[PDB]
């Protein structure tokens, strides 16, 4: 009758801690399913870039391999794209070897700033934070041509703030999720026990 009390206030408290845990895992899935909100709004964006990406005509390419002597605005919206790929020269005869050549078209297809390095995104940050060029209005105004790619460029950049933002939100949701599906599991094997 001692034991059995013994085990009856044992089982008492592990009842009441297996209440808690199922209470903490109900919060951990309600802070789970606001992460998962922030992750579908960060997929949309992505989709959204990739559809910017889309959004590239093959003549629009050629008019700048064809351009000898351009626009200052043009010239820095493809400085823009120059040292994302990682090319630190900037004279227009010099640079034109990278537009020229046709690895040029597919790198621009499967690009993400996910591998991108932090250190060379900074510098694209620092330069392209006080363009003229990287206002839409100057792009647009100066050629169509430079249009839709210095679009995607400004889609990239805004996309690296998105994702500073992205990957603690994203390191969030993974913990939230896992700590709710632990936390549930938890639960089921205290009641178990209960």
């Known amino acids: 009758v001692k034991d059995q009390q013994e085990a009856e206030k044992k089982k008492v408290m592990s009842q009441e801690i297996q209440e808690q845990l199922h209470k903490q895992q109900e919060v951990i899935a309600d802070k789970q399913m606001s992460v998962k909100e ?30 000898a ?29 990278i537009i020229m050549r046709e690895n040029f078209i597919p790198t621009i297809v499967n690009f993400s700033a996910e591998e991108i390095s932090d250190a060379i995104r900074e510098k694209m ?15 647009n105004r100066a050629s169509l041509a430079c249009g839709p790619m210095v679009k995607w460029a400004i889609a990239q950049l805004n996309y690296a703030d998105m994702l500073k933002r992205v990957e603690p939100l994203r390191n969030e949701l993974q913990k939230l999720e896992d700590d709710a599906k632990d936390n549930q599991q938890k639960a089921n094997e205290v009641e178990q026990m209960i």
Do not use: F
């Open 125 to 139: 940050k620092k330069n392209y934070m006080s363009n003229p060029s990287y206002n839409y209005e100057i792009v």
């Open 38 to 67: 922030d992750l579908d709004k960060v997929e949309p964006a992505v989709i959204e870039a990739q559809n910017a990406v889309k959004s590239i005509k093959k003549q629009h390419l050629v008019e700048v391999r064809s351009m």
């Open 69 to 97: 002597n351009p626009p200052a605005a043009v010239k820095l919206a493809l400085e823009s794209i120059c040292l994302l790929l990682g090319e630190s020269t900037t004279d227009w005869k010099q640079i034109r070897s």
